[PDB]
Amino acid sequence: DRGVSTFSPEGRLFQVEYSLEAIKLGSTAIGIATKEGVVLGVEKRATSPLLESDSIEKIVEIDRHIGCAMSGLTADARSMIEHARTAAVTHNLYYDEDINVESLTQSVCDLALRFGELMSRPFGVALLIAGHDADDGYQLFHAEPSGTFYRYNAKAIGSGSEGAQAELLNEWHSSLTLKEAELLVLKILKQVMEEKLDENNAQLSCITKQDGFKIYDNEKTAELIKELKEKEAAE
Amino acid sequence: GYDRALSIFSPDGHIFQVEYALEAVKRGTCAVGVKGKNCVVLGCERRSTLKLQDTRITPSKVSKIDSHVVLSFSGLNADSRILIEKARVEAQSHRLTLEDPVTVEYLTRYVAGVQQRYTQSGGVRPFGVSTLIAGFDPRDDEPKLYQTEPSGIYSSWSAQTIGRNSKTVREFLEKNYDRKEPPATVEECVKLTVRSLLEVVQTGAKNIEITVVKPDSDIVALSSEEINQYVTQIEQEKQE
Amino acid sequence: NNYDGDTVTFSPTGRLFQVEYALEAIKQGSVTVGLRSNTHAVLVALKRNADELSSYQKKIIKCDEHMGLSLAGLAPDARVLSNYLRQQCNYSSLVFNRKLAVERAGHLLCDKAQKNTQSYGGRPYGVGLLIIGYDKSGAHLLEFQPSGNVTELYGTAIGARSQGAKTYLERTLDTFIKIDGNPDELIKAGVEAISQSLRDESLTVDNLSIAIVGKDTPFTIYDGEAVAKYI
Amino acid sequence: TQQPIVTGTSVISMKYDNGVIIAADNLGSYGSLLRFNGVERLIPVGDNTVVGISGDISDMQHIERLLKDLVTENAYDNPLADAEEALEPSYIFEYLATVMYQRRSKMNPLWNAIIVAGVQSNGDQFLRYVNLLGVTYSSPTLATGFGAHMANPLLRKVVDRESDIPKTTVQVAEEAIVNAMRVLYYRDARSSRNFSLAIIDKNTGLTFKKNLQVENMKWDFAKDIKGYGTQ
Amino acid sequence: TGYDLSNSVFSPDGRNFQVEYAVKAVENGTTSIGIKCNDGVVFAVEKLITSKLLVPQKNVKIQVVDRHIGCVYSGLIPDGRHLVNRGREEAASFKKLYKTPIPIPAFADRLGQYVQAHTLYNSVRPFGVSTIFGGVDKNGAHLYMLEPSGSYWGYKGAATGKGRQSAKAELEKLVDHHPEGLSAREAVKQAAKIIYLAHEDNKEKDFELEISWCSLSETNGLHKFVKGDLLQEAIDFAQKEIN
Amino acid sequence: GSRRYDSRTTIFSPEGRLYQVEYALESISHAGTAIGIMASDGIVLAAERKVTSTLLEQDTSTEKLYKLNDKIAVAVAGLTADAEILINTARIHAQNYLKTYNEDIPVEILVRRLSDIKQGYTQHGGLRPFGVSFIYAGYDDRYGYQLYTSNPSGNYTGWKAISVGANTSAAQTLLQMDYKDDMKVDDAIELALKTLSKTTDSSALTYDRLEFATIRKGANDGEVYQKIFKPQEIKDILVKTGIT
Amino acid sequence: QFNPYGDNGGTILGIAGEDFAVLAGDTRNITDYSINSRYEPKVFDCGDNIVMSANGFAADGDALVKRFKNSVKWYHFDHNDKKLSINSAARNIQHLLYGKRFFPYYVHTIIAGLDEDGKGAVYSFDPVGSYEREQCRAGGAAASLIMPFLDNQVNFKNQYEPGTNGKVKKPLKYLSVEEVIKLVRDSFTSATERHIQVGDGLEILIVTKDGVRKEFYELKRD
Amino acid sequence: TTTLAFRFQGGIIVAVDSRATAGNWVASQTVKKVIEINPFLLGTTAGGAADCQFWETWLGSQCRLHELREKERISVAAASKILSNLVYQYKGAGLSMGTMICGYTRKEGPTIYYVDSDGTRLKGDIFCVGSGQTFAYGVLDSNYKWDLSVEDALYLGKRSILAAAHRDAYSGGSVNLYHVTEDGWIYHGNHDVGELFWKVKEEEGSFNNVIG
Numbered sequence A: 001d002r003g004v005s006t007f008s009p010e011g012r013l014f015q016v017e018y019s020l021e022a023i024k025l026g027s028t029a030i031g032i033a034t035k036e037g038v039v040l041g042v043e044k045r046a047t048s049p050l051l052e053s054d055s056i057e058k059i060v061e062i063d064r065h066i067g068c069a070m071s072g073l074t075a076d077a078r079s080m081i082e083h084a085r086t087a088a089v090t091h092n093l094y095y096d097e098d099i100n101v102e103s104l105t106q107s108v109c110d111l112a113l114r115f116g117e118l119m120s121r122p123f124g125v126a127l128l129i130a131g132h133d134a135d136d137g138y139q140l141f142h143a144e145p146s147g148t149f150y151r152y153n154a155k156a157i158g159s160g161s162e163g164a165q166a167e168l169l170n171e172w173h174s175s176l177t178l179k180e181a182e183l184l185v186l187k188i189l190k191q192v193m194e195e196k197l198d199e200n201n202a203q204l205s206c207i208t209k210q211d212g213f214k215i216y217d218n219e220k221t222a223e224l225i226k227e228l229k230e231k232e233a234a235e
Numbered sequence B: 001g002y003d004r005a006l007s008i009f010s011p012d013g014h015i016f017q018v019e020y021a022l023e024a025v026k027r028g029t030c031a032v033g034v035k036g037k038n039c040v041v042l043g044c045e046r047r048s049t050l051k052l053q054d055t056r057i058t059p060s061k062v063s064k065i066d067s068h069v070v071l072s073f074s075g076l077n078a079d080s081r082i083l084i085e086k087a088r089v090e091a092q093s094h095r096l097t098l099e100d101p102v103t104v105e106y107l108t109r110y111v112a113g114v115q116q117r118y119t120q121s122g123g124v125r126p127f128g129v130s131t132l133i134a135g136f137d138p139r140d141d142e143p144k145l146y147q148t149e150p151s152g153i154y155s156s157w158s159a160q161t162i163g164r165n166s167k168t169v170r171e172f173l174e175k176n177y178d179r180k181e182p183p184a185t186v187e188e189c190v191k192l193t194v195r196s197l198l199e200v201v202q203t204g205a206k207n208i209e210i211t212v213v214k215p216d217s218d219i220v221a222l223s224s225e226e227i228n229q230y231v232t233q234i235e236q237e238k239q240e
Numbered sequence C: 001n002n003y004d005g006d007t008v009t010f011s012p013t014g015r016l017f018q019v020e021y022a023l024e025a026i027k028q029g030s031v032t033v034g035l036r037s038n039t040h041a042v043l044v045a046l047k048r049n050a051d052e053l054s055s056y057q058k059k060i061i062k063c064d065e066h067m068g069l070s071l072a073g074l075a076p077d078a079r080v081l082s083n084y085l086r087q088q089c090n091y092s093s094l095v096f097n098r099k100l101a102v103e104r105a106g107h108l109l110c111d112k113a114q115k116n117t118q119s120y121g122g123r124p125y126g127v128g129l130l131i132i133g134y135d136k137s138g139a140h141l142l143e144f145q146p147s148g149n150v151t152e153l154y155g156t157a158i159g160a161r162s163q164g165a166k167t168y169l170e171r172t173l174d175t176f177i178k179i180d181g182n183p184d185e186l187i188k189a190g191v192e193a194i195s196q197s198l199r200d201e202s203l204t205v206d207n208l209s210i211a212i213v214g215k216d217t218p219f220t221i222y223d224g225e226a227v228a229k230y231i
Numbered sequence D: 001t002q003q004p005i006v007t008g009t010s011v012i013s014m015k016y017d018n019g020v021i022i023a024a025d026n027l028g029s030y031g032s033l034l035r036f037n038g039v040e041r042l043i044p045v046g047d048n049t050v051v052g053i054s055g056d057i058s059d060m061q062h063i064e065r066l067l068k069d070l071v072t073e074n075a076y077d078n079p080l081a082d083a084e085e086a087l088e089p090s091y092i093f094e095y096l097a098t099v100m101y102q103r104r105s106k107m108n109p110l111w112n113a114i115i116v117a118g119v120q121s122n123g124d125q126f127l128r129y130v131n132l133l134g135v136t137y138s139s140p141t142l143a144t145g146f147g148a149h150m151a152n153p154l155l156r157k158v159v160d161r162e163s164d165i166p167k168t169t170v171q172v173a174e175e176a177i178v179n180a181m182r183v184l185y186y187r188d189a190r191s192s193r194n195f196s197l198a199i200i201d202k203n204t205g206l207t208f209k210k211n212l213q214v215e216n217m218k219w220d221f222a223k224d225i226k227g228y229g230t231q
Numbered sequence E: 001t002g003y004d005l006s007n008s009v010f011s012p013d014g015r016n017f018q019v020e021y022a023v024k025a026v027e028n029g030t031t032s033i034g035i036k037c038n039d040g041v042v043f044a045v046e047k048l049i050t051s052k053l054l055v056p057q058k059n060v061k062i063q064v065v066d067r068h069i070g071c072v073y074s075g076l077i078p079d080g081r082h083l084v085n086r087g088r089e090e091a092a093s094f095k096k097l098y099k100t101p102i103p104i105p106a107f108a109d110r111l112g113q114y115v116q117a118h119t120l121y122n123s124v125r126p127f128g129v130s131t132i133f134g135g136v137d138k139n140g141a142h143l144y145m146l147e148p149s150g151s152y153w154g155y156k157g158a159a160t161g162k163g164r165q166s167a168k169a170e171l172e173k174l175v176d177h178h179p180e181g182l183s184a185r186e187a188v189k190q191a192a193k194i195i196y197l198a199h200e201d202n203k204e205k206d207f208e209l210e211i212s213w214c215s216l217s218e219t220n221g222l223h224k225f226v227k228g229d230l231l232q233e234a235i236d237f238a239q240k241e242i243n
Numbered sequence F: 001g002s003r004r005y006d007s008r009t010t011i012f013s014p015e016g017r018l019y020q021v022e023y024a025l026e027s028i029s030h031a032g033t034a035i036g037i038m039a040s041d042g043i044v045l046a047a048e049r050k051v052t053s054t055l056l057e058q059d060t061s062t063e064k065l066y067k068l069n070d071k072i073a074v075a076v077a078g079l080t081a082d083a084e085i086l087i088n089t090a091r092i093h094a095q096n097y098l099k100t101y102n103e104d105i106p107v108e109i110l111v112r113r114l115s116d117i118k119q120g121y122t123q124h125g126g127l128r129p130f131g132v133s134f135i136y137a138g139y140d141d142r143y144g145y146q147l148y149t150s151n152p153s154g155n156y157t158g159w160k161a162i163s164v165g166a167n168t169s170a171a172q173t174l175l176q177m178d179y180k181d182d183m184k185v186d187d188a189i190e191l192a193l194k195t196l197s198k199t200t201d202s203s204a205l206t207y208d209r210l211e212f213a214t215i216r217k218g219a220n221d222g223e224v225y226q227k228i229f230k231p232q233e234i235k236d237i238l239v240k241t242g243i244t
Numbered sequence G: 001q002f003n004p005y006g007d008n009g010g011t012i013l014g015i016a017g018e019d020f021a022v023l024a025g026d027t028r029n030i031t032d033y034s035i036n037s038r039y040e041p042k043v044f045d046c047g048d049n050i051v052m053s054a055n056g057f058a059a060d061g062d063a064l065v066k067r068f069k070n071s072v073k074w075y076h077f078d079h080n081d082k083k084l085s086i087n088s089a090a091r092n093i094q095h096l097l098y099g100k101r102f103f104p105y106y107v108h109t110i111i112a113g114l115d116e117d118g119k120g121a122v123y124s125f126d127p128v129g130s131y132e133r134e135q136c137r138a139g140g141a142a143a144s145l146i147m148p149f150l151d152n153q154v155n156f157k158n159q160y161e162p163g164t165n166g167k168v169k170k171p172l173k174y175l176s177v178e179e180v181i182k183l184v185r186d187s188f189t190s191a192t193e194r195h196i197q198v199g200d201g202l203e204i205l206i207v208t209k210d211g212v213r214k215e216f217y218e219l220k221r222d
Numbered sequence H: 001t002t003t004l005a006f007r008f009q010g011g012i013i014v015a016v017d018s019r020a021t022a023g024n025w026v027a028s029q030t031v032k033k034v035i036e037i038n039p040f041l042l043g044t045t046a047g048g049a050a051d052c053q054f055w056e057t058w059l060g061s062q063c064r065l066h067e068l069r070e071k072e073r074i075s076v077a078a079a080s081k082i083l084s085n086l087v088y089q090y091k092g093a094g095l096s097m098g099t100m101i102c103g104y105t106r107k108e109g110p111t112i113y114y115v116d117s118d119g120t121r122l123k124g125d126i127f128c129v130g131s132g133q134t135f136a137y138g139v140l141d142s143n144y145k146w147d148l149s150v151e152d153a154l155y156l157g158k159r160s161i162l163a164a165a166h167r168d169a170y171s172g173g174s175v176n177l178y179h180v181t182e183d184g185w186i187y188h189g190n191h192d193v194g195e196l197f198w199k200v201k202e203e204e205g206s207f208n209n210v211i212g
């Protein structure tokens, strides 16, 4: 065989590059940042109709001001979330304040490359970390298993990512409202999803300064879905 | 200490050791879980190539984790003991610190976390086991049924099956199980479970195990004659 | 070929291929430039983005009030090494009440990267660094490579198409070395140098990144509207 | 937890217009027994610092080795080891200060009181104290043991505050030190007549004087004293 | 086969191919030399000027161990630094326990055992440097040369790097023509010449000369760099000899 | 480094099998056959020694049958050296339980722990598994007389009658035919010997190529006795059943 | 037996205004009955408009200030040059002190600066990390002399409105920087008179939005 | 210190003094001895100040992590046990803590737990903790009924602290009141003993031992 921390001739870590392929197989997750808030939405993708879809937890709270959506080998994310939550609360204990969204993301990304021959392999999951703080306001980050993170105005990860990213490129502007951003996530999710989009197989969430991080109910999302279909038919 | 990274990614983005662990689960004897309106029933297959067995002392397929939660499995039997043991210890630890027994979701989450840890730890291979964890939360009458697998993912099911020929019995349950109206009584739920196993098993003699779990730590295992009555009743109605 | 499985193996011609592959990761990285006079030392770094919706990857890191670097390659590896430099700079302050010499800073990085190239299990660092600083012997500029080789220079550049900026500085050597007591003009020379490595793209407001240290100037970084002056 | 065995008494020092003076007798006491008479308790570090040490001599000799080893370590990979990157008094002090406090914090102290006297590279006079507890302080005059009680009062009549330092010449300052050493010989039961003195001037550099003696002593009035009252 | 893939594996010859491969890295490097003299030793090295952008005199390659030992090497520069860092630890522990500064032969074995240790396991890589070192101790002057295998001997003169054969030939003439001995100041001038003569084997890029020395009379038994007037005098002597 | 030479003993095949466990079982299938039969009033352990030489000291020998405590014994099939490592661990575990609870260890508990040790070698440590299969014969006051078996996988199961080692397929068919639930010990002794006599690869079954043991309540009133058969005692029981 | 603690004497004082805050401390350092230094500062600018003093055992005091200064440095590295707020600095110091709960720093710590609303702030600590924001605090050897004077003059304790039959209290109001420095100087001259470990010199560090200013005043040298 | 909290018809009353001491030296008169862990949990401090302050704040972090992990507010029982198990690990080292964990949850209802630094953990309806606990007990016990109104219960708690503040030399400053209901805790103000004493004396006609 060969080493776990080996470089390829092109100057890339084999294991990190292979973990990126696993993330492409994962379910779609989209995030959009606005001045009124940041929205996070995911494709649940139940493997069978007998599976109770409400138990599929792919959107997750880290703190009251930071949320998280995932894509790929979702089991790997549990320890990442656990670390993130501990980091956030620990900083709150030491400094009597909320922790910056960038600092939280950086803390999570420090785990990424702690593998070799430490854990045995990289994480097989990508994260969209959305939040708000007083300094840099509403922020959306994309955290990879390479240890790298980019801030985004909007970002899609998972199987329908490249198709959705091209759609976000056209649709995003710096004056989007929250209601507009909610519909835009639903619109783009319905386009890339295999099965027909409804309240049971897709989930929405947002983070605002006032109310903090909230996962939407199936009743609330259903009305946004109905509002979306009517507006598209209206022209 | 033995450090080797046994579970690693491949060019196509797969962790083969985890996927090969799923093959061990597919080889294992069938196990089924069906939850009704006020109960959950765990059915299990027992292969009949083993006669001259001592059923008194032979390890039973369904295991109590606490007085209110149970765990059945499919895959490597030796591996399952290690998960069950850890789960039983965590169950007592939770009662000790929180002063309340575990929820079925929490216990499942713990067991799944262990399975996951063995997919990215050095010197260890993944568990060749998938589990069905069922029960009732403390002071709660809503039935709970969960499933775990070697990768570490877990989820809740209205009804579910794992093991060999599980795709056949899952097909049966998908059309026979109504979400709007689950099995109203214990008899109805047990019958549907036995029916689903009879699609795969062979004979309804000493091949099927049934364990009924009801609220407030009310768990009982059915005997041969009791199960045989369901087998006799189903076959007579079938001839129509 | 058969001798690139790990860093502990030499090739028949006496090469370490894993170290060379780590060197390759730097060439893929975005361009960055370093230069100095006798009074000031300047870093100029072209930041890179994933797409128009994304931010621009931050290239420059501060290590102390009098020292910092710019990176090219694996960013996490730059974070590990810069963190180590921050600790060493800080150890020098707490224990000896002494600002760490830029030359020693280089020696310490060299010895850290080396240990990774001689032991089984580990890997070489996949990043190149340009360290600038002002200490008791004036301004300094260092070039770090993950092979371990550290080099003190008047000017240099690393990353993709860095040869364009490096040639310009080799011509301009006599001019920019004597830009003493003038920060803006030394930056202008650095911005003109990095421009020789540009293709199709040009320097925009949220693309360019500049840092400076000097005689009466702490290590500070300029981004956003603060670098609009130099476009 | 220690108890000091072979011990050294007072170390005295002061600043003057161009530098600093420091002195300490050549005795190694073993309780009340005046065991060793050829003990040098002033130890120069480079050509710009002198460390004066009192207390346990075994611990003094350990500190000697640490300083000796510090000069060696500083020379490593340092072309400016005898120039810009030479060891400063402030660097030498902070190192010892760190050690002393770390040792007290492990309940295993170096049973000493130390005074680091020297001149900095910019011409500034350096004088600072540190002891077994890690306690540090600076003052125009500094003294250990009995020196603190007897020498300081005399030395503070010459330099009472900061503004008195430019007004004090090396002749005046050395006279005050030599006088203080005589007073200590009169009154300290663990002191000797033989001592060493060191001057670190910003112009003339390091002057180390050995085998000095206390002289011009007043003893003649003793003959007139009788009994203890009546007699 | 496959005997050359792993370190510490004997080939059917009885050879460790990984060590011989490390020697190739040494041969690839710049030239460095050592000259033993009447009451001390002289070290010199070739520094290739890759670019105009290199600061002259400010990329020092010769390293001091303790206060009396000089070390220079050819090959993987980082590997050389690692070895000197160990040497400095070894010399420090010797002086800590035994008081006296470490003798040169004693020091030589400390490096020798450490380099040899890196040929015993597959989990470590052999050193990619040949190290010329020495100094003055109680028994007089000593010059040594240490190789990737851990092999070292005492030398009258020593040379390694890309221009080793040219330098070796020039060193052999000095041993023959000066049987009674060579002086310390002479050895500095000769060292300059031999580096310049050895530069013919690396003449694409022009170079920078760097010399150091230990001498009982001239440097008082301590390691010092040759700088200023004495350096320029040695360069002029070398320049006059090539023409 | 050393990665090159690692066999990777604790991994899965593409089919979801443990290579080393499967191969260890292949090893055990060549070992001398051992049989266990459980009756209502006792248990029988019978085993066939591996190709005996005439100059082998038979009376002062122990290859197949081992005593774990006063109430529990095991029959071995595989590497003897491996088994003895495990047997000493089991012997210690039984004494720890007695020391802790002042009660002899229940049979299933001892079997589980020994099986858990084998499991460990298949999941972690990077070492080869124990090439051993046991037949546990024991008694306690909860389940009475019990027969178990464990293999290198660490999986254990309970039995009324069971064989391990060579020719188990043939042996298990013969046991399945003639066994019944109301059986006595003396009948089970006869069955055990008859089964070995038909499955043996040797020309004829003799006293010098057998180890034999019983666990009866044949002591005086409500107590269990372990009888490891002497050479002469095996000779007599072989004549009594009419095999020689 | 070795005793790892000592008493270096002196005393410190913190007062908060509406848009400013002061932290004062004498410059005298002592052991037993000897003066070590007549000018040895123990009130330090720690950056981010935070001044700090840790009075008592100077070795522990210097060690703590040195660690907090270092804590501020790493806060900037780890959180994008964010300004450390006074409340955050306080909580951080609690963990530094409590970190040695079972082998304490023998110091009474006081920090001063501005809160996030721009208003003056003084936090004070016990040796093991207990802290509380106040308008007013004196610490160290002569704390017992100065503190009650501050209660009376800064917080107007025991002062009622004349002619109101001791029913209406004297209303609370902020003090000007001029009035505060007057109280500081009087507090230290009074303490110098009656406490032997206090004297030589007085150094005050004033903190406004503009920065950190210093003022020095002579004290009696006996 | 003096701290109390008692259960009654209308929920839980919690009352504390505000004095800190360093021997006979009054270190502070304005100290907060009630830690607000969450909108439904309170924690009272008595004993070593840093010990209480540090570890109850730490407790708040552990309770936050619980509700993040479990998606549900921590039970009063579990919260109290985290703290009691922590101090038990330090038993013998010299921690000094007298705490009361008070709160409401759906499954428990209003609940009070006494926890101290030698590991004692007790559920109960009435507790008084601190140097002046005995003085508070005297007034509280003699006036306590389950059927007290919210108005009367608040006053009894305030009056009990006042009683102890007066007699106990190591208690005083001011009274901090809290009321815990099914809807969460409600702060009922800071009450300076300087004014409160004379107000109570006059209106209630009590404290006849003092020169009026």
Ligand SMILES: *[C@@](C)(CO)[C@](*)(O)[C@H](Cc1ccccc1)NC(=O)[C@H](Cc1ccc(OC)cc1)NC(=O)[C@H](C)NC(=O)CN1CCOCC1
Pocket: G104, G126, G127, G128, G130, H001, H002, H019, H020, H021, H022, H027, H031, H032, H033, H045, H046, H047, H048, H049, H050, H052, H053, H094, H095, H096, H130, H131, H170, H171
């Ligand atoms: C009353 C006033 C009696 O003390 C209370 O118990 C009060 C509670 C309290 C709670 C939070 C904030 C402030 C005050 N306790 C104190 O004021 C406390 C009394 C005390 C001191 C020391 C003890 O030894 C363990 C136990 C109780 N006072 C302090 O903690 C004072 C302010 N600090 C110190 O004495 C510092 N010491 C503490 C022990 O370690 C050495 C340093």
